[PDB]
Amino acid sequence: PPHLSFRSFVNALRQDGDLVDINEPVDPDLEAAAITRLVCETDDKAPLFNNVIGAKDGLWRILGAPASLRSSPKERFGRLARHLALPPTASAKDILDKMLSANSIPPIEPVIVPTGPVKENSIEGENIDLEALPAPMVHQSDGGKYIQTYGMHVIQSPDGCWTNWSIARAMVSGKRTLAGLVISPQHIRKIQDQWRAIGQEEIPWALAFGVPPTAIMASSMPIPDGVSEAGYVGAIAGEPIKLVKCDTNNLYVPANSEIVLEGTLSTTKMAPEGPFGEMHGYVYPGESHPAPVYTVNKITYRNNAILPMSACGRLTDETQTMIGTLAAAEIRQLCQRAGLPITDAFAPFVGQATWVALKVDTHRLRAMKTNGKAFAKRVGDVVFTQKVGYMIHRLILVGDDIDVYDDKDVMWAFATRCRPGTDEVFFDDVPGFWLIPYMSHGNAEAIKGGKVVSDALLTAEYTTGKDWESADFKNSYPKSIQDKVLNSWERLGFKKL
Amino acid sequence: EPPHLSFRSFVNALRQDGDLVDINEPVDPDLEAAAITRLVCETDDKAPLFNNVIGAKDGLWRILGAPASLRSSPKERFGRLARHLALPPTASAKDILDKMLSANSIPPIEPVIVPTGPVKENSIEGENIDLEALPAPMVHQSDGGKYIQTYGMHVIQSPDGCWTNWSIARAMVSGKRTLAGLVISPQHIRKIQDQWRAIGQEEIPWALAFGVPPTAIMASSMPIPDGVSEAGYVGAIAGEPIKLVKCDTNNLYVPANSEIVLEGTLSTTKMAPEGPFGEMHGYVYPGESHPAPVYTVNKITYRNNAILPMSACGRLTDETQTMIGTLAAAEIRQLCQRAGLPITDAFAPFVGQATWVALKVDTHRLRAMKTNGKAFAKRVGDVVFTQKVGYMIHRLILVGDDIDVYDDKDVMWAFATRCRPGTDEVFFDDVPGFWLIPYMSHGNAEAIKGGKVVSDALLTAEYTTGKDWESADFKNSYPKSIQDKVLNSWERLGFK
Ligand SMILES: Cc1cc2c3c(c1C)C(C)(C)C[C@H]1C[C@@H](C)[C@]4(C(=O)NC(=O)N=C4N2C[C@H](O)[C@H](O)[C@H](O)COP(=O)(O)O)N31
Ligand SMILES: Cc1cc2c3c(c1C)C(C)(C)C[C@H]1C[C@@H](C)[C@]4(C(=O)NC(=O)N=C4N2C[C@H](O)[C@H](O)[C@H](O)COP(=O)(O)O)N31
Ligand SMILES: [K+]
Ligand SMILES: [K+]
Ligand SMILES: [K+]
Ligand SMILES: [K+]
Ligand SMILES: [Mn+2]
Ligand SMILES: [Mn+2]
């Protein structure tokens, strides 16, 4: 099924009329990404480049915008829903609820198969030349060809028991090497550091492109420390992921992956990495920074293999539909397990994946007999001292009349219920996400502080209750008047609602 | 008369643009008219003209809802505002604000007096007036009365006779012959009321003109300077005089083609319960009235087939967001320029609910000052937040000249990615605070003081050596040769 096979998923998008088959030659040097970028900025159909200039022996086609938005408001999240066995009409809440569903139920462990489509073709050792493959130039000022924007890194702990799946960028650095981000507090870096501590120079690693869509979603989600994503993915799907062992190492990859790289992640060697047009909408031309080296020793791939590509940057791409939103999901769960009265969380698109809005159960809040200043500090202390809060710099607390999945409602609440400064608690001492330009290119420490909890609950919401009515059609007119207007609307000559 | 100089011409201009629905079915002024208008404003539909208002008698009145709300077509979004000002329907928000500022720098065109006009076609006087029997709208179900006055022009003159102010301030029917309405500091209607109070005048000559020339209602919502009569400013915008007729029962003058004029007095002593009212920030507080001054109405004159304009204000988007914060932003821009600050442009992002202004910085000029965001933000706030034009604005966002301040998406992108919360903000605890905002009147600190911020959304290098990034967008991250190959293939390949 589509959630368990990238190839099935591609056909599901084609069946939905959410995919353009581009059969004309497209240059992987900027042209494919430029098409993808414009799809993302216009919420168009996903582009499938079936004729990439420089492709050879089945490597490769490219799918752009694999989890970007559709333009129909009723199926806006449909391409995300097709990762997860949900209907194209699924809400953002439906998607986040499904991704959280595995945190309260036993894992469904993966099953092993002896082969699969990912073994249909191979290139090994000296025959590998990554600079001769059609890796895309994703933005004109990038420091290299970002082959890795939507694949899953596979890496296992020294005791063999924790295998982490995650997305982190990587670019081609040479004939047999990539360089890519391995940053604190991410699990790929935690495991890298476990190996470094016991003296391992080259860690077994694999990078799988075009994995089962449920697996790429979990790869982007900050599920708990020491939890192998494979079993979590199985529990989301209600059935196991079928894995096949790598040929050159003891790691396992999904048997129907499009393309797998087998090799090592170094503890000892770094190489210039970046710059890269990133999730906040910026590239800094000429600004590389050292990152770890991955060495590729074998490539295996499906016939007619497809490389997925996120041309990330300004709204709206995978970095905002998945990174911020899946962090929001985990922040919601963390707040609930801290005892805070949070029902829902989302990462508003306007915040460029740096904001999370938290919806408060105000009945429960009133029973907890607190106040905004105390509550805002407690929420920040809970969230900003945990990994799931790392990338988020502004938390907005809103009452339960605000739809946190609607950026218009969040902005209205923020602008009219949070007195600037007075109703905010600032956090100078917590880990800060250096990739945001106001952090690495700003006025204070790149890696520390710069966070805020904004209390956008009005004072009476903590005590006696909501005492206003919205000046809107829904709340300032009685049902009898609303029904009269809706029944007259089109006859009078107004646009269908 | 052209649409910018006649409300009646303006209504026909909207009809000609396909921007007006003639509602000939009966509509109740008790909530139904405002509910229709509210839904038009929430969906950017055509302006509703209620030609059959239940309880209308002897020509009073028709209602026009949503007179300056938005159109749904992106290319003509501000078209209803542009029709106020002799601009094309495709006019940008910047074209509109620039036109409103245009009279700052040219001599006023003084009004001309005419002996009569359409506004004198009908009258009701003295004890024949019963404001409670007129079809004044109930605009929101929890309002404290019928807000007859949401889009008319108060006319009031200083004791020395030299300053005649035109402004919009809400008022509701409060009795057979009385309105009650907001007369708040620091507004010019209150400054003038206080000048009369100080010399012992009990009843100040006043008029309220409904359906004034559209250029006049736009100036009525603009904070032009203390002591400057809006009439000559309006003439300078329109490129010719507004024709005024003297009131019958006092010495004030009103536009000769107004739809409806109330003549009477504003009391310096008498108060009555006023509000609550569903207001510009999207809220009404049921039961929360506060004493406000009394207006006494002694004569009504009106046009045949008179139209009462109505703003059913509240959540986005209505006249309070298209006019109040935007025209304040225009004046804040010029205030900053007179202070010698390097500001080129300003707008009130719709997302801010008329409490935000984004200021566009000339970064070349900024770099010449060799300053920093922390120092600059404090200076900008010290200028803006102690002036009347800054009163209603609680958050200024400073952005560089790669940000379109007229585009909420660009403003939010800059705010979210270039202003480090707290670190890059200067808070103002001691300045006048706009109590109408819920987080002020119904919040955790003084209702009338503080709660303001300047947010520095310029990146650090913008102050020193210059912009050192490029946007990760189609426009900026791909060469023109590639952009053109894509745009030339786009529809052929199957994209929208
Ligand atoms: C959906 C997505 C997720 C990304 C990234 C991207 C996309 C599309 C691309 C590659 C386009 C851009 C960069 C941007 C960059 C943030 C980063 C990365 O290079 N480094 C990083 O550490 N985390 C990244 N994530 C987030 C990451 O997958 C999650 O944080 C996940 O929880 C980690 O899994 P573990 O919890 O198991 O540790 N990239
Ligand atoms: C376009 C508009 C402008 C409004 C209001 C409204 C509309 C539609 C309504 C009536 C719907 C809602 C209230 C909301 C409320 C803010 C107020 C008001 O009741 N009191 C006030 O003092 N200012 C208002 N203004 C702004 C005012 O016109 C400008 O500030 C103008 O510069 C004043 O002229 P002077 O500079 O010459 O002093 N009203
Ligand atoms: K993960
Ligand atoms: K608050
Ligand atoms: K005015
Ligand atoms: K800044
Ligand atoms: Mn993990
Ligand atoms: Mn004035």
GROMACS .gro file of C-alpha atoms in nm, chain B residues 52-306:
model
  255
  549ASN     CA    1  -3.557   4.791   0.183
  550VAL     CA    2  -3.466   4.838   0.548
  551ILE     CA    3  -3.753   4.725   0.778
  552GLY     CA    4  -3.898   5.028   0.959
  553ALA     CA    5  -3.764   5.284   0.704
  554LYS     CA    6  -4.009   5.579   0.675
  555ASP     CA    7  -4.024   5.924   0.501
  556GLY     CA    8  -3.695   5.857   0.328
  557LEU     CA    9  -3.487   5.741   0.630
  558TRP     CA   10  -3.306   5.526   0.531
  559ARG     CA   11  -3.123   5.278   0.305
  560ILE     CA   12  -2.797   5.126   0.442
  561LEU     CA   13  -2.465   5.064   0.265
  562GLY     CA   14  -2.256   4.803   0.448
  563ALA     CA   15  -1.880   4.746   0.404
  564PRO     CA   16  -1.808   5.079   0.231
  565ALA     CA   17  -1.423   5.037   0.243
  566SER     CA   18  -1.375   4.659   0.289
  567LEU     CA   19  -1.175   4.433   0.054
  568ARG     CA   20  -1.259   4.274  -0.284
  569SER     CA   21  -1.183   3.904  -0.340
  570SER     CA   22  -0.993   3.944  -0.672
  571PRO     CA   23  -0.619   3.987  -0.587
  572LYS     CA   24  -0.570   4.238  -0.874
  573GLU     CA   25  -0.846   4.471  -0.736
  574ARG     CA   26  -0.820   4.385  -0.361
  575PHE     CA   27  -0.823   4.756  -0.258
  576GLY     CA   28  -1.063   4.865  -0.533
  577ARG     CA   29  -1.339   4.988  -0.295
  578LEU     CA   30  -1.078   5.211  -0.120
  579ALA     CA   31  -0.939   5.325  -0.459
  580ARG     CA   32  -1.297   5.437  -0.557
  581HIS     CA   33  -1.289   5.671  -0.252
  582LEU     CA   34  -0.984   5.854  -0.399
  583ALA     CA   35  -1.007   5.875  -0.786
  584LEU     CA   36  -0.757   5.587  -0.813
  585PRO     CA   37  -0.798   5.286  -1.046
  586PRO     CA   38  -0.951   4.971  -0.891
  587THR     CA   39  -0.608   4.794  -0.938
  588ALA     CA   40  -0.443   5.055  -0.705
  589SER     CA   41  -0.199   4.907  -0.447
  590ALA     CA   42  -0.232   4.985  -0.074
  591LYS     CA   43   0.085   5.197  -0.122
  592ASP     CA   44  -0.086   5.395  -0.403
  593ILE     CA   45  -0.375   5.470  -0.159
  594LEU     CA   46  -0.153   5.575   0.136
  595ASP     CA   47   0.080   5.776  -0.091
  596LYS     CA   48  -0.230   5.960  -0.228
  597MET     CA   49  -0.352   6.034   0.131
  598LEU     CA   50  -0.001   6.170   0.220
  599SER     CA   51   0.014   6.376  -0.108
  600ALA     CA   52  -0.173   6.671   0.065
  601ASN     CA   53   0.103   6.691   0.332
  602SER     CA   54   0.332   6.876   0.087
  603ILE     CA   55   0.090   7.089  -0.129
  604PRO     CA   56  -0.111   7.395  -0.017
  605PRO     CA   57  -0.463   7.315   0.105
  606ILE     CA   58  -0.751   7.368  -0.144
  607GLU     CA   59  -1.003   7.552   0.077
  608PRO     CA   60  -1.368   7.449   0.061
  609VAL     CA   61  -1.623   7.662  -0.131
  610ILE     CA   62  -1.963   7.762   0.015
  611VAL     CA   63  -2.284   7.687  -0.180
  612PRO     CA   64  -2.630   7.814  -0.070
  613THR     CA   65  -2.792   7.467  -0.088
  614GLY     CA   66  -2.744   7.109  -0.204
  615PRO     CA   67  -2.902   6.762  -0.204
  616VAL     CA   68  -2.851   6.731   0.177
  617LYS     CA   69  -3.122   7.005   0.213
  618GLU     CA   70  -3.389   6.805   0.015
  619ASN     CA   71  -3.567   6.692   0.337
  620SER     CA   72  -3.573   6.780   0.706
  621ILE     CA   73  -3.702   6.677   1.050
  622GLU     CA   74  -3.669   6.935   1.331
  623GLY     CA   75  -3.689   6.971   1.709
  624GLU     CA   76  -3.970   6.774   1.878
  625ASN     CA   77  -4.053   6.591   1.548
  626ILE     CA   78  -3.713   6.409   1.588
  627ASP     CA   79  -3.730   6.062   1.746
  628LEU     CA   80  -3.396   5.888   1.700
  629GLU     CA   81  -3.536   5.571   1.869
  630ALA     CA   82  -3.799   5.540   1.584
  631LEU     CA   83  -3.538   5.554   1.304
  632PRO     CA   84  -3.401   5.226   1.162
  633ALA     CA   85  -3.057   5.260   1.327
  634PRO     CA   86  -2.878   4.925   1.308
  635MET     CA   87  -2.806   4.685   1.588
  636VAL     CA   88  -2.457   4.602   1.460
  637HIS     CA   89  -2.367   4.315   1.702
  638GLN     CA   90  -2.603   4.123   1.933
  639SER     CA   91  -2.419   4.231   2.256
  640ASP     CA   92  -2.382   4.600   2.166
  641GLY     CA   93  -2.516   4.841   2.429
  642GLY     CA   94  -2.733   5.023   2.172
  643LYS     CA   95  -2.801   5.095   1.807
  644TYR     CA   96  -2.476   5.226   1.652
  645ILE     CA   97  -2.618   5.475   1.401
  646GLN     CA   98  -2.265   5.622   1.377
  647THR     CA   99  -1.998   5.385   1.243
  648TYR     CA  100  -1.902   5.567   0.916
  649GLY     CA  101  -2.010   5.929   0.939
  650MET     CA  102  -1.797   6.241   0.989
  651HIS     CA  103  -1.817   6.446   1.313
  652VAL     CA  104  -1.774   6.821   1.243
  653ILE     CA  105  -1.659   7.030   1.538
  654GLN     CA  106  -1.481   7.367   1.554
  655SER     CA  107  -1.236   7.518   1.803
  656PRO     CA  108  -1.332   7.824   2.011
  657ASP     CA  109  -1.113   8.056   1.792
  658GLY     CA  110  -1.307   7.942   1.483
  659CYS     CA  111  -0.987   7.857   1.295
  660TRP     CA  112  -0.982   7.475   1.325
  661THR     CA  113  -1.278   7.269   1.202
  662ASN     CA  114  -1.203   6.899   1.263
  663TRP     CA  115  -1.358   6.613   1.064
  664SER     CA  116  -1.325   6.268   1.224
  665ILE     CA  117  -1.489   5.929   1.267
  666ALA     CA  118  -1.582   5.821   1.623
  667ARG     CA  119  -1.858   5.571   1.712
  668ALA     CA  120  -2.192   5.682   1.856
  669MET     CA  121  -2.514   5.507   1.948
  670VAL     CA  122  -2.872   5.628   1.992
  671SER     CA  123  -2.924   5.709   2.363
  672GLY     CA  124  -3.268   5.876   2.361
  673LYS     CA  125  -3.531   6.054   2.154
  674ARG     CA  126  -3.294   6.346   2.078
  675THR     CA  127  -2.951   6.215   2.194
  676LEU     CA  128  -2.651   6.005   2.095
  677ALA     CA  129  -2.374   5.888   2.321
  678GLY     CA  130  -2.030   5.819   2.178
  679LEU     CA  131  -1.658   5.789   2.238
  680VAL     CA  132  -1.475   6.120   2.279
  681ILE     CA  133  -1.134   5.990   2.389
  682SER     CA  134  -0.786   6.134   2.439
  683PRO     CA  135  -0.582   6.195   2.231
  684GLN     CA  136  -0.837   6.243   1.949
  685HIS     CA  137  -0.908   6.586   1.802
  686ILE     CA  138  -1.279   6.571   1.891
  687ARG     CA  139  -1.175   6.536   2.258
  688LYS     CA  140  -0.900   6.802   2.232
  689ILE     CA  141  -1.165   7.046   2.098
  690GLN     CA  142  -1.428   6.937   2.355
  691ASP     CA  143  -1.170   7.009   2.630
  692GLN     CA  144  -1.092   7.358   2.484
  693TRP     CA  145  -1.469   7.441   2.506
  694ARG     CA  146  -1.489   7.290   2.858
  695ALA     CA  147  -1.200   7.514   2.977
  696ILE     CA  148  -1.389   7.836   2.872
  697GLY     CA  149  -1.726   7.723   3.020
  698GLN     CA  150  -1.928   7.640   2.705
  699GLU     CA  151  -2.196   7.380   2.804
  700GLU     CA  152  -2.320   7.288   2.454
  701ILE     CA  153  -2.067   7.297   2.167
  702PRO     CA  154  -2.198   7.342   1.811
  703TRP     CA  155  -2.166   7.007   1.628
  704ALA     CA  156  -2.279   6.820   1.322
  705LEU     CA  157  -2.251   6.460   1.207
  706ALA     CA  158  -2.256   6.402   0.829
  707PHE     CA  159  -2.333   6.053   0.693
  708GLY     CA  160  -2.242   5.959   0.331
  709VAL     CA  161  -1.992   6.240   0.288
  710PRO     CA  162  -1.768   6.267  -0.020
  711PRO     CA  163  -1.551   5.952  -0.004
  712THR     CA  164  -1.226   6.159  -0.003
  713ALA     CA  165  -1.363   6.337   0.309
  714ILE     CA  166  -1.442   6.011   0.499
  715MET     CA  167  -1.083   5.884   0.425
  716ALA     CA  168  -0.934   6.208   0.570
  717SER     CA  169  -1.180   6.178   0.866
  718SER     CA  170  -0.999   5.847   0.955
  719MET     CA  171  -0.647   5.997   0.908
  720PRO     CA  172  -0.450   6.153   1.198
  721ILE     CA  173  -0.345   6.475   1.012
  722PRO     CA  174  -0.188   6.734   1.248
  723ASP     CA  175  -0.338   6.920   1.543
  724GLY     CA  176  -0.494   7.249   1.425
  725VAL     CA  177  -0.519   7.144   1.053
  726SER     CA  178  -0.880   7.154   0.920
  727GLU     CA  179  -0.948   6.834   0.722
  728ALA     CA  180  -1.156   7.026   0.461
  729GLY     CA  181  -0.854   7.196   0.292
  730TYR     CA  182  -0.649   6.872   0.315
  731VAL     CA  183  -0.942   6.687   0.146
  732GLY     CA  184  -0.947   6.954  -0.124
  733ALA     CA  185  -0.570   6.901  -0.183
  734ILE     CA  186  -0.626   6.520  -0.222
  735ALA     CA  187  -0.930   6.562  -0.455
  736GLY     CA  188  -0.754   6.834  -0.666
  737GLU     CA  189  -1.052   7.074  -0.616
  738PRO     CA  190  -1.267   7.226  -0.339
  739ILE     CA  191  -1.526   7.034  -0.137
  740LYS     CA  192  -1.855   7.225  -0.172
  741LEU     CA  193  -1.998   7.292   0.178
  742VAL     CA  194  -2.341   7.418   0.286
  743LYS     CA  195  -2.399   7.591   0.621
  744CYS     CA  196  -2.604   7.399   0.877
  745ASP     CA  197  -2.953   7.544   0.934
  746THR     CA  198  -2.932   7.555   1.319
  747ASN     CA  199  -2.563   7.646   1.378
  748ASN     CA  200  -2.265   7.807   1.202
  749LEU     CA  201  -2.088   7.480   1.103
  750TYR     CA  202  -2.059   7.365   0.742
  751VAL     CA  203  -2.120   7.017   0.598
  752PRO     CA  204  -2.068   6.867   0.251
  753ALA     CA  205  -2.356   6.989   0.031
  754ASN     CA  206  -2.413   6.637  -0.111
  755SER     CA  207  -2.400   6.446   0.224
  756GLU     CA  208  -2.673   6.179   0.247
  757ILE     CA  209  -2.788   6.266   0.604
  758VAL     CA  210  -2.677   6.543   0.845
  759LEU     CA  211  -2.752   6.564   1.218
  760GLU     CA  212  -2.715   6.918   1.359
  761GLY     CA  213  -2.690   6.989   1.729
  762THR     CA  214  -2.443   7.011   2.014
  763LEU     CA  215  -2.182   6.808   2.201
  764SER     CA  216  -2.210   6.857   2.579
  765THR     CA  217  -1.910   6.936   2.800
  766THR     CA  218  -2.113   6.826   3.108
  767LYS     CA  219  -2.382   6.566   3.014
  768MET     CA  220  -2.283   6.193   3.011
  769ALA     CA  221  -2.482   5.880   2.928
  770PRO     CA  222  -2.413   5.507   2.923
  771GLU     CA  223  -2.222   5.413   2.605
  772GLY     CA  224  -2.115   5.076   2.462
  773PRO     CA  225  -2.021   4.806   2.466
  774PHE     CA  226  -1.951   4.780   2.092
  775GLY     CA  227  -1.807   4.504   1.876
  776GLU     CA  228  -1.481   4.680   1.796
  777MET     CA  229  -1.181   4.693   1.563
  778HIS     CA  230  -0.981   4.424   1.749
  779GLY     CA  231  -1.262   4.162   1.710
  780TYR     CA  232  -1.423   4.170   2.059
  781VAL     CA  233  -1.734   4.285   2.245
  782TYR     CA  234  -1.762   4.260   2.623
  783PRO     CA  235  -2.135   4.206   2.699
  784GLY     CA  236  -2.277   4.445   2.958
  785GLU     CA  237  -1.965   4.668   2.975
  786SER     CA  238  -2.095   5.023   2.923
  787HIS     CA  239  -1.899   5.331   3.038
  788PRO     CA  240  -2.022   5.693   3.058
  789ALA     CA  241  -1.959   5.896   2.742
  790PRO     CA  242  -2.055   6.246   2.631
  791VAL     CA  243  -2.404   6.331   2.504
  792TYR     CA  244  -2.474   6.470   2.160
  793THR     CA  245  -2.810   6.649   2.126
  794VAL     CA  246  -2.975   6.646   1.781
  795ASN     CA  247  -3.193   6.951   1.693
  796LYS     CA  248  -3.235   6.902   1.315
  797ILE     CA  249  -3.184   6.624   1.058
  798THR     CA  250  -3.151   6.718   0.691
  799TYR     CA  251  -3.120   6.452   0.420
  800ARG     CA  252  -3.120   6.361   0.053
  801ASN     CA  253  -3.413   6.194  -0.117
  802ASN     CA  254  -3.348   5.814  -0.103
  803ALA     CA  255  -3.089   5.879   0.177
   0.00000   0.00000   0.00000
